[PDB]
Scaffold this active site. Structure first.
Site, PDB file in Angstrom:
ATOM      1  N   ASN A  11       0.818  -1.182   0.000  1.00  0.00           N
ATOM      2  CA  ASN A  11       0.000   0.000   0.000  1.00  0.00           C
ATOM      3  C   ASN A  11       0.863   1.247   0.000  1.00  0.00           C
ATOM      4  O   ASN A  11       1.769   1.396   0.852  1.00  0.00           O
ATOM      5  CB  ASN A  11      -0.934  -0.019   1.191  1.00  0.00           C
ATOM      6  N   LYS A  13       0.053   4.916   0.360  1.00  0.00           N
ATOM      7  CA  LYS A  13      -0.971   5.932   0.699  1.00  0.00           C
ATOM      8  C   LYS A  13      -0.540   7.396   0.402  1.00  0.00           C
ATOM      9  O   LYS A  13      -1.406   8.292   0.234  1.00  0.00           O
ATOM     10  CB  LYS A  13      -1.407   5.785   2.170  1.00  0.00           C
ATOM     11  N   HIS A  87     -11.636  -1.159   6.039  1.00  0.00           N
ATOM     12  CA  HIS A  87     -12.695  -0.983   6.935  1.00  0.00           C
ATOM     13  C   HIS A  87     -12.314  -0.932   8.423  1.00  0.00           C
ATOM     14  O   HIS A  87     -12.832  -0.108   9.187  1.00  0.00           O
ATOM     15  CB  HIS A  87     -13.804  -2.032   6.733  1.00  0.00           C
ATOM     16  N   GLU A  89      -9.689   0.161   9.860  1.00  0.00           N
ATOM     17  CA  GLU A  89      -9.139   1.500  10.128  1.00  0.00           C
ATOM     18  C   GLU A  89     -10.248   2.566  10.055  1.00  0.00           C
ATOM     19  O   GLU A  89     -10.328   3.458  10.914  1.00  0.00           O
ATOM     20  CB  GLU A  89      -7.981   1.751   9.121  1.00  0.00           C
ATOM     21  N   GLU A 159      -6.989  -7.211   9.882  1.00  0.00           N
ATOM     22  CA  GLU A 159      -6.163  -6.024  10.141  1.00  0.00           C
ATOM     23  C   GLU A 159      -6.622  -5.417  11.461  1.00  0.00           C
ATOM     24  O   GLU A 159      -7.489  -4.536  11.512  1.00  0.00           O
ATOM     25  CB  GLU A 159      -6.293  -4.998   9.017  1.00  0.00           C
ATOM     26  N   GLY A 165       0.243   0.547  12.010  1.00  0.00           N
ATOM     27  CA  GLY A 165       1.114   1.708  12.134  1.00  0.00           C
ATOM     28  C   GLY A 165       1.753   1.866  13.500  1.00  0.00           C
ATOM     29  O   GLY A 165       2.428   2.874  13.757  1.00  0.00           O
ATOM     30  N   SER A 205       1.611  -3.941  10.793  1.00  0.00           N
ATOM     31  CA  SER A 205       3.019  -4.034  11.189  1.00  0.00           C
ATOM     32  C   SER A 205       3.773  -5.219  10.647  1.00  0.00           C
ATOM     33  O   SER A 205       4.781  -5.669  11.220  1.00  0.00           O
ATOM     34  CB  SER A 205       3.131  -3.921  12.748  1.00  0.00           C
TER      35      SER A 205
END
Length: 239
Positions: A11, A13, A87, A89, A159, A165, A205
């Site tokens: 990803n 971002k 979703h 997050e 997730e 993060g 992570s």
């Protein structure tokens, strides 16, 4: 081969077009020995660069949190056929409801996309023993809007928000337990055939050091991670 084909999704971002261009060159030059679908996911502002530069036969491009009908149509007309719906997050930061993600999944599938739907619990949910109820509520909302044959186009990512993060990766045992819980629900409520073919990816992570030991778990089918040089090692981990 008992596991389905693995997926490794990177990803992007944010960050410089020049540093992205360099990572894409790295990936384009990387020989990959085994059957894995690699994915580079990015926001709209970076898609034109990714689509132009990426050329590896084992890679596809995905859109991160693509938007509405107009946006899906714009993706389809640009040749992008995968979407990532973050979703777990968005539920934490924005209060996105389970029903909103479920409708997004069904709209994307109906428009011909492959969809990675990310589900997962918060830190407090984990601490209080609410993980199974929370995760199962999310998968059931998604399932409500799908027919059995639609699952060929769906990938689930576990997730947990506490791992996103934070540098706090799920242990192999934690990932396995969550992934097994999801798969067993799919087996029971959708079908054993669907459950066996479903890819359940782990995100949060993941790095070049912890990916291989995660992949060795029975119900882990790959990863979501950042787009970084170590992603080459995350791909290798899916062997």
């Amino acid at each position: 081969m008992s596991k389905p084909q693995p997926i490794a999704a990177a990803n992007w971002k944010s960050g410089s077009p020049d540093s992205l261009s360099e990572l894409i060159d790295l990936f384009n030059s990387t020989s990959i020995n085994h059957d894995v679908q690699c994915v580079v996911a990015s926001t709209f502002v970076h898609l034109a660069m990714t689509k132009e530069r990426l050329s590896h036969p084992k890679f596809v491009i995905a859109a991160l949190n693509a938007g509405n009908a107009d946006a899906l149509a714009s993706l389809k007309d640009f040749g992008v056929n995968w979407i990532v719906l973050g979703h777990s997050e968005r539920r934490w930061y924005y209060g996105e409801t389970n029903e909103i993600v479920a409708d997004k999944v069904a709209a994307a599938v109906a428009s011909g996309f492959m969809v990675i739907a990310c589900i997962g619990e918060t830190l407090q949910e984990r601490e209080s023993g609410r993980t199974a109820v929370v995760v199962l509520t999310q998968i059931a909302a998604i399932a409500k809007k799908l027919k059995k044959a639609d699952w060929a186009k769906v990938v689930i990512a576990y997730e947990p928000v506490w791992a996103i993060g934070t540098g706090k990766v799920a242990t192999p045992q934690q990932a396995q337990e969550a992934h097994a819980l999801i798969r067993s629900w799919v087996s029971s409520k959708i079908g054993a055939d669907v459950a066996g073919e479903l890819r359940i990816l782990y995100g949060g992570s993941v790095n070049g050091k912890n990916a291989r030991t995660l992949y060795q778990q029975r119900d882990v089918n790959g990863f979501l991670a950042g787009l970084k040089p170590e992603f080459v090692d995350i791909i290798k981990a899916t062997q």
